[PDB]
Amino acid sequence: KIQEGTLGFFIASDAKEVKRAFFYCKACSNVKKYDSTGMFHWCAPKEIEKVILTRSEAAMTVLSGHVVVCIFGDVSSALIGLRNLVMPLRASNFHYHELKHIVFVGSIEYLKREWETLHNFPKVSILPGTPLSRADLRAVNINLCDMCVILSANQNNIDDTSLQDKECIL
Amino acid sequence: LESVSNFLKAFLHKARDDVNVEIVFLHNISPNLELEALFKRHFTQVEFYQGSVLNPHDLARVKIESADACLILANKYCADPDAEDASNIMRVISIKNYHPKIRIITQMLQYHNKAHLL
């Protein structure tokens, strides 16, 4: 129940319409499954070697309704924060059966840099390869996926600005 | 200077008789003294414009809709051939977005990258 004066967030066409809200009267067994706060799903740390998927292993594994994140990065690329993409996808208000598998398609050299912030999540897999490889995309069953996210992980490039989305567009 | 020199030697040749086409270069880097001199030597049939083929306004400036063809030259001597091939493919994408019916002849550096044109 609301109490005293509480700010409400409204979606409206104009401020004059939302001003009407203020001028209103009725008549006139014991295993750690979450983090410390319980806000996000948590898992025991895993070595990166455990989650690496080869083309054959990923092909035999069936992946449906997952999320395929294709990243264009190398060892010297600037680190985007991938934990900011995984954390909202493991938010403790989705059931563990509702969590979507996240498969990272990109250079393993780049992902080894960022795995220190990602190893504490339930279901994440890595396929070392290239987002531009049709074989790699077919191994991850990209036609069965819920969403494919093409990230310009090589944001640190400085070129003719228009030629900065070339890899994502291709 | 080098690429335009080779292109003009192969294209604007004295032995060639029927030349009713006018060459229009569109590049976002201002030519140096030698390139300006080379353009001046062929002033009657060669024009240069400072713009980006990826900018629709610059495409409108060079009259892409009325252009008979668009020829894209590649940097043969570059550290990353794949990056240059991707840049040329993106230029093709921009030109086709502006005018899908224009004829394009593009230079590619690697065989596999040609697949991206399909």
From TrEMBL, chain B:
It is found in: Cell membrane. Signal peptide: none annotated. It comes from the Eukaryota. Residues 1-118 form the RCK N-terminal domain. Belongs to the potassium channel family. Calcium-activated (TC 1.A.1.3) subfamily. KCa1.1/KCNMA1 sub-subfamily. This is Calcium-activated potassium channel subunit alpha-1. The lineage of its organism: Eukaryota, Metazoa, Chordata, Craniata, Vertebrata. The chain holds residues 418 to 535 of 1234 of the full protein.
